[PDB]
Design an enzyme around this catalytic site. Sequence first.
Site, short mmCIF file in Angstrom:
data_model
loop_
_atom_site.label_atom_id
_atom_site.label_comp_id
_atom_site.label_asym_id
_atom_site.label_seq_id
_atom_site.Cartn_x
_atom_site.Cartn_y
_atom_site.Cartn_z
CE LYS A 1 0.09 31.16 12.79
NZ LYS A 1 -1.04 31.11 11.80
CE1 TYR B 1 0.24 16.72 15.52
CE2 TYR B 1 -0.89 15.21 16.99
CZ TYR B 1 0.05 15.44 16.04
OH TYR B 1 0.81 14.35 15.59
CG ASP C 1 -3.53 32.52 2.24
OD1 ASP C 1 -3.02 32.39 1.09
OD2 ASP C 1 -2.86 32.50 3.29
#
EC number: 2.7.11.1
Length: 265
Positions: free
Chosen positions: A36, A86, A130
């Site tokens: 990221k 991942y 979120d």
Amino acid sequence: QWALEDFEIGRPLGKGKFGNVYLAREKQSKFILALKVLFKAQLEKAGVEHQLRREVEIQSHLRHPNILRLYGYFHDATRVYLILEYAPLGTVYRELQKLSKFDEQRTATYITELANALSYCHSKRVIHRDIKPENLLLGSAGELKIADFGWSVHAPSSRRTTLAGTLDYLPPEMIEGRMHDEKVDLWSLGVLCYEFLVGKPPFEANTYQETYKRISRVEFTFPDFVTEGARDLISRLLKHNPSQRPMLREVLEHPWITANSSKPS
Ligand SMILES: Nc1ncnc2c1ncn2[C@@H]1O[C@H](COP(=O)(O)OP(=O)(O)O)[C@@H](O)[C@H]1O
Ligand SMILES: *SCCC(=O)Nc1cccc(Cl)c1F
Ligand SMILES: [Cl-]
Ligand SMILES: [Cl-]
Ligand SMILES: [Cl-]
Ligand SMILES: [Mg+2]
Ligand SMILES: [Mg+2]
């Protein structure tokens, strides 16, 4: 310790407001991971350095099957790199686009996995705030993992960070800028359960101004095919008054969840 030279970069996996995420392989071990990539200039301009730190703090220390692991990090003067587990089956967002709607078994199973992870966090008074489909990832056996803990806080909390994109998953006390607590995640779980069965979230509207009004007034209705048991659970979660929303324990034992989930609580 780690540097960019230690990795071969590959397939682009996705883009968020800040994160540019790529498949990558570490050269010596051949370990596959998701890298990221964040730009320091962008983090500084938006004022979200504290969100990067929070994401690293929480996700590097946990070892829960339904929470995405963070293995480490490094940086290089224009960029910060987060080394992530991942998730080979992609986002729940992508899966809903593919199938349009989820059946009751898939839906109840996902809600169970979500409630298991969030029950662990709420036991530490940590609220995610979120929970939306683009932040829910799928493991090699199709198991759900919560990611993107950058917006998380300990409860109770106020809000000082500017809201970004859609309002669609946030409760009345959050969009109105009031004090809030664990119950924010219970409202978002109700929004998800509706969206998984119907294919669109319950307060979806064609402007920001109208979405805000629909949320503040709790204006939602059910299509004919949504069953009595699903209506009962969603109606319990989408309460204006946070104190009236159930605890996650009560969600996990709801008759519609235990009847349809393929995973245990
Ligand atoms: N570990 C991962 N495995 C596979 N895809 C990922 C992974 N992490 C993120 N992605 C993809 O990248 C997107 C953005 O990552 P995210 O961590 O949510 O960034 P942001 O903090 O900018 O929202 C996700 O919505 C998803 O599409
Ligand atoms: S959200 C699940 C539990 C959790 O957040 N544990 C944890 C780990 C490391 C730091 C802090 Cl503040 C934590 F709350
Ligand atoms: Cl740090
Ligand atoms: Cl409606
Ligand atoms: Cl109410
Ligand atoms: Mg995200
Ligand atoms: Mg984030």
